[PDB]
Amino acid sequence: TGQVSVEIEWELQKENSKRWNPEIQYTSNYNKSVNVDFTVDTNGVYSEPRPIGTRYLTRNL
Amino acid sequence: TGQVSVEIEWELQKENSKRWNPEIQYTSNYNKSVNVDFTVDTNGVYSEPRPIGTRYLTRNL
Amino acid sequence: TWALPTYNNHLYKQISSQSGASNDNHYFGYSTPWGYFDFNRFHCHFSPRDWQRLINNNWGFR
Amino acid sequence: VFMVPQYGYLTLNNGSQAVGRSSFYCLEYFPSQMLRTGNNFTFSYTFEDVPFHSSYAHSQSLDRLMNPLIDQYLYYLSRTNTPSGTTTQSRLQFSQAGASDIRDQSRNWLPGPCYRQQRVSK
Amino acid sequence: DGVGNSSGNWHCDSTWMGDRVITTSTRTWALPTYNNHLYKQISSQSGASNDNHYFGYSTPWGYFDFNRFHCHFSPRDWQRLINNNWGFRPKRLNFKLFNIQVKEVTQNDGTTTIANNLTSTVQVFTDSEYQLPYVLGSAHQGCLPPFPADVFMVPQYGYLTLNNGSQAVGRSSFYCLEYFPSQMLRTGNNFTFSYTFEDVPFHSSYAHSQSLDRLMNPLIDQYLYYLSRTNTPSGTTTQSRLQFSQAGASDIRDQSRNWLPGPCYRQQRVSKTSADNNNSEYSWTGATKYHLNGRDSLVNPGPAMASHKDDEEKFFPQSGVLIFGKQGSEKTNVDIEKVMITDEEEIRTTNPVATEQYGSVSTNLQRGNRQAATADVNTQGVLPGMVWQDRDVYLQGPIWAKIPHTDGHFHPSPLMGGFGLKHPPPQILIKNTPVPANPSTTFSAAKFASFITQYSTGQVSVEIEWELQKENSKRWNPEIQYTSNYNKSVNVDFTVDTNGVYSEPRPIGTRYLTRNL
Amino acid sequence: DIEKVMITDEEEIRTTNPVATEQYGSVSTNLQRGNRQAATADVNTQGVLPGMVWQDRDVYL
Amino acid sequence: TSADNNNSEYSWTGATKYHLNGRDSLVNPGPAMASHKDDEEKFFPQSGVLIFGKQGSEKTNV
Amino acid sequence: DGVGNSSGNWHCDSTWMGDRVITTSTR
């Protein structure tokens, strides 16, 4: 047994949009729930509730 | 008559949170509508549909 | 782009509340031929997207 | 396109009438640059240092700042009287606040000032 | 250096150098594996009243706290400090974790076998950036013990976030402590780090010798007039005539004064003698409280204000003072003799009495056909010109507290007393690294549950440097100092009994020297 | 009518700021004793007291 | 004006005061606040203003 | 160094620097 550690460096292409109206972003729901999303429950079991895909910002063709 | 132009420089305090679960952000609704939010209608009348307040990110006390 | 008329026909005027007005609503002042610029509302400088960019990402600004 | 607002100001008043202290200002008394077509007017300003406006909402309430697992070491007045046979007798009893009685934990801080309002519903 | 070379040397002495004091204290600690190495979500019980709801998490991490004064000062050291100094404050601190021990317990067959595990490690990290909820300064248990000999058990870290009753709102924050880089230690390693406090005002260790109401010269009259008498006799029936006078020794209550006492949020008054107190359950219904988000929360201790007027040592505010427990006191519903109730008579010169109303104010415009009426103020907000004294700090009392990160805090000195720091000493979190037992030879994606039982032990040492404001009084008659009683007793104060149990018999507050206003 | 305006919402500052509609707290107004029950009164207006913390009003677009 | 004022000894019972250590002490002058509204130069606070004596005024009950 | 000296220090943080991000994770 023992520890393993992986580090990765990622480059980014910053969003530069000049769109006027507000875009769509990813937000956790404001409403109350017995468990918060992406967190251990009463028995200590982490769980990813939904799949998150990278496409929320929009650009023209 | 004539043109007026005002420029302002604003300083920012970048969010540095180490929270694990995803935070709440401001997003326009995904659903279809006869008018998009924050845009001129059929007759060219711009309109701010809802008030937007600055408090969405969360920090501890 | 802005447009500026000639207010008060180029004359300073003294103005006050109406005799009928309740005591809470009395006032006395002047109206001037001058027009002023104001941009004290936030949307004057930020566009909705710009505003979105600002709130989502920053803890503070000034 | 917008229309420039018209400037006016209010000073002291005694009802409709204006008291002696009231100030009348002639705007022209101030030097003002005169522009013709093909001229421009620019000027620059730097704000004073001011505190950043918080664009965050706290994730922890003030009443809840303590650790749920460990009890405090300070005591509070839990129960003022205790049963004595059939009729209850005045006896003071103290306890240490814990998760069970969070409302009673000792705390360093107090909420913000309040001037109360009336409540109307949508 | 090596497995068999000690990481550090034990240090416990207080050394005084002019106006500076360094107090070092070393303790041995033990750290279990909390929550079986699993983060857990915790909340109040369905039955719990709405005032008692909460939602948060319990973490496998254990933290160090030393926010109690006796952790650093010995009773004699404390005596030296109060008698001699008008003020003091913390300057900087040094913290060390050395002689780390990790052991393994084999509990098969009803007999427990404990043995070294030189390979296993402890993860320690300091939250120097304050991205973790600060659980310090809430007067929790587990402080480095007052007595040096005692061994203590490291507290377990947990935190509370937003909640809507039992349920947790969307805004609630879940923090993974591991997400923070934490240095890993083996036996024969050490962890040290240093911190320097921010400039803060000295905590007054003096009690004023002059009351606020009395600051004037007894011999000379004022030159300002006050409304002495509103009406005067006119034959048989008295007539409305205004008369003015200059206040003097004779009518001291009337002298004009520049200053006002400190703000007051009023308390309920309960007496140490059972007889006086009313026979009813007013512990909560009669208590002074504030409201946040629909939850009534008891205001304890509350704004600093004297506990009792003259000759009323018998009384004390319901929740307006600190109350420490005598050694051996249980958790729930102890009798009065089992606690120690603190006493704030010192601040009465400038601070109101918690039980009494701040003042009287006139509420109606009088006239010929309407008598002059006034009403009491039980709650006065700060007004310009007020002066007050912050709450006292005791040997068993808290040292500091994190000022909440908000737009506005006014006079942000912790209400329990202590030093209100913006950037307080960072929380130190330590957790045994989990070690997996014999795994199954065939692969399985499910997470492990069969860890090797472990606990770690070792020494911890904290040093703090304190600055002093030496007493410079030119008073003629002798002052009041703190002295142990001359009389014989079966046990000396502040010492282990026949069975080796250290015990602090009484609370010691810093205010004995006196200065003028 | 109400539908013709937009009413702002300050739920964010509730963690440290009182609820505008509700009273700040309760304070005891009489000295109890054997023959006198313990009574308290609500405070609808509390001035700043030492130790208070609060959040300034939000700014909107 | 003597007439307006009520015919009673309210100099102390009716006065605004604060309490320190069980002693009621008159709050004079007290926090700065205007002495009278418009057109009420006739009135003044009981102990809310400064009062100087004209030259030659005695000590008690002038 | 030795049997009783830890080989490494635990790292898990993501740090953002302009258009670059470094994400480290230890298990």
Side-chain angles (χ1 to χ4, degrees), chain E residues 178-179 181-184 186-187, chain H residues 3-4 6 8-10 12-14:
Chain E
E178 309 173 348
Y179 193 78
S182 75
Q183 167 188 359
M184 303 171 75
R186 276 194 192 173
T187 185
Chain H
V3 148
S6 86
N9 289 337
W10 184 284
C12 274
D13 61 356
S14 178

Side-chain angles (χ1 to χ4, degrees), chain C residues 1-5 7-8 10 12 14-19 23 26-38 54-55 57-62, chain D residues 1-18 22-30 32 48-56:
Chain C
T1 299
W2 50 267
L4 171 71
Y7 291 110
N8 296 159
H10 291 307
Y12 283 82
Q14 161 206 304
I15 54 158
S16 64
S17 44
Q18 301 292 14
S19 46
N23 183 42
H26 276 310
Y27 67 86
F28 176 92
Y30 299 88
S31 87
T32 59
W34 289 75
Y36 68 106
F37 282 95
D38 59 19
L54 171 80
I55 57 164
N57 297 276
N58 299 123
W59 275 334
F61 67 102
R62 83 175 165 231
Chain D
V1 180
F2 78 108
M3 174 193 268
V4 173
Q6 158 183 42
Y7 179 70
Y9 60 91
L10 290 177
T11 189
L12 291 177
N13 65 323
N14 171 345
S16 45
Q17 293 177 335
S22 313
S23 283
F24 161 54
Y25 285 102
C26 183
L27 274 67
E28 309 173 348
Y29 193 78
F30 294 88
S32 75
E48 46 192 339
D49 289 345
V50 290
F52 284 94
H53 153 101
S54 295
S55 67
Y56 57 82

Side-chain angles (χ1 to χ4, degrees), chain E residues 30 36 135 143 150 159 164 174-175 196 206 234 238 240 244 265 278 294 296 308 326 363 368 424 449 454 488 496 510:
Chain E
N36 202 54
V135 288
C143 65
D150 309 338
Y159 60 91
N164 171 345
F174 161 54
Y175 285 102
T196 299
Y206 57 82
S234 68
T238 59
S240 89
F244 303 91
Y265 197 62
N278 192 31
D296 290 321
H308 64 256
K326 273 155 166 153
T363 59
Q454 272 181 355
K488 64 179 180 180
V496 301
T510 55

Side-chain angles (χ1 to χ4, degrees), chain E residues 407-421:
Chain E
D407 296 345
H409 40 77
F410 173 70
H411 204 68
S413 150
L415 275 164
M416 292 180 196
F419 303 92
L421 306 153

Side-chain angles (χ1 to χ4, degrees), chain A residues 7-41:
Chain A
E7 183 178 2
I8 301 208
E9 188 185 13
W10 310 77
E11 188 169 3
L12 304 175
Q13 190 154 276
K14 187 181 31 60
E15 155 279 336
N16 195 13
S17 64
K18 293 334 167 181
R19 155 171 166 167
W20 181 265
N21 65 354
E23 284 190 3
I24 313 180
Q25 314 283 2
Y26 180 67
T27 189
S28 52
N29 291 107
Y30 43 75
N31 283 341
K32 64 179 180 180
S33 64
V34 175
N35 313 332
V36 209
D37 283 347
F38 304 85
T39 59
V40 301
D41 63 51

